[PDB]
Amino acid sequence: FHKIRNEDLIFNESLGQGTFTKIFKGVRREVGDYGQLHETEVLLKVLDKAHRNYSESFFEAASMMSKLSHKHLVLNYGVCVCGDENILVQEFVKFGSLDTYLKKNKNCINILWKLEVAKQLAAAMHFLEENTLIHGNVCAKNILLIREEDRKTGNPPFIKLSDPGISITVLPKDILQERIPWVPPECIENPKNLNLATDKWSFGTTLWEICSGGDKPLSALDSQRKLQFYEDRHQLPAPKAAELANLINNCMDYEPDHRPSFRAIIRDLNSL
Ligand SMILES: N#Cc1ccc(Nc2nc(N)n(C(=O)Nc3ccc(OCC(=O)O)cc3)n2)cc1
C-alpha cells in the first residue's frame, strides 16, 4: 500500500460508520498524470482508536483484494498512518452504498435493473472465486453504485464491491450474531469455517436485499431469535420481486458443499 501523508489529505463531512470504522468524505492533493496537480475526492475509512487491536485485520483484507485488479472491485489509493489513526484512502463512488439507494428509489427500480446488478455482483464473485480469494462480508451495504441507469442512453447501472472490512474470524460473537443472515450458519457454529462457500451464502442474502427494496432480512429478530432461525434451519421468505426467490434459496444452502459455483449462478441469472 502506497503511504499517503496526512498533509495531503483534507477531512470533510462524516458519511457514517462501518464496523469499528468511521467514514468521511475527503480530498487528496496529488501530482497526477503528465505532472498536473490534482485535488481528488476520496473516501476515508478510519479505524477507531478504541479498536486499534483490529488494525491488522482491516488492512490485510483491503490489501489482499487490492492485489487483484478488476472493473467491479473498488480502487484503493493507499493508506495514511501519519498520526493517531489508521486510514484507508479509497476512490469516492458518486452514489454510495446500494442498500441506501434501493430504499430511496424503491418505487422506481424494476426487475431488469435488479438482474443487471445481480449479474455484475456475480461476475465480481466469480472473479474472486477463480482467484480463490474469500471476501467474507458480501452485503448490499458493501456494494457501491458508480453509475445510475440512463433510460435515454440505454446504459445500465454499474456497481463495484467494496473491501471486506474486519474478518469474521476475529470479530466478537455479538457482532457476528447480529450479522445473521449474512454470516453463514457454519461460521456462527465456528468463525474459523470461513471458506469460499461462505460467499455463496452471503450472495443469496444480498440478492434478497436487492429484491426487497433495501429491507434488512430478519431485522425484527434480536440476536437470540436469529440464532434460533439457524437452529431450526429456516429459509428467508420470498422477497417482493419473487423472480429470484429460487436462486436466493439455492445459494442459502445449509450444506456449504452443495452451494452452487458462481459460474452456475451466472448461468441461472442469464436464464431470465
Ligand atoms: N450520502 C452519501 C454517500 C455518497 C457517496 C458515498 N461514496 C462511497 N464511496 C465509497 N468507496 N464508499 C464506501 O466504501 N462506503 C462504505 C462505507 C462503509 C462500509 O462499511 C462496511 C462495513 O464496514 O461493515 C461500506 C461501504 N462510499 C458514500 C456515501
Go through the domains of the chain in sequence order and give each one's CATH number. Answer: 1-92 (3.30.200.20), 93-272 (1.10.510.10)
How many other C-beta atoms can be found within 10 angstroms of the C-beta atom of residue 47?
23
Q: What's the CA gap between 154 and 136, in Å, rounded?
A: 33
In the chain, count H helices and then E strands. Answer: 9, 7
Q: What's the CA gap between 236 and 241, in Å, rounded?
A: 13
Q: How far are the Cα atoms of 138, 201, 208, 229 from residue 195, in angstroms, in the given order?
A: 13, 11, 21, 22
Give the experimental resolution in Å. 2.1
Q: Indicate the pairing of strand 21-31 with strand 9-18.
A: antiparallel
Peptide bond into 156 cis (omega under 30): no
**What are the backbone dihedrals phi and psi of residue 217, each rounded to the nearest 5 degrees, phi first?**
-60, 140
Q: Ligand 1: distance of its center to the CA of 96 in Å?
A: 5
Solved using: X-ray
Q: Does ligand 1 have an atom closer than 6 angstroms to the CB of 24?
A: no
Angle at 76 between CA 71 and CA 79, to 5 degrees: 170
Residue 227: all three cell numbers together:
440464532
Give 33's contacts (C-beta < 8 A, 6+ positions apart). Answer: none
Q: Does ligand 1 have an atom closer than 6 angstroms to the CB of 19?
A: yes
Nearest CA to ligand 1 atom 19: 18
Q: Does ligand 1 have an atom closer than 6 angstroms to the CB of 210?
A: no
- Burial environment of residue 210 by CB neighbours within 10 A (0 to 12, 13 to 18, 19 or more): buried
Give 244's contacts (C-beta < 8 A, 6+ positions apart). Answer: 114, 118, 207, 211
Q: Does ligand 1 have an atom closer than 6 angstroms to the CB of 96?
A: yes
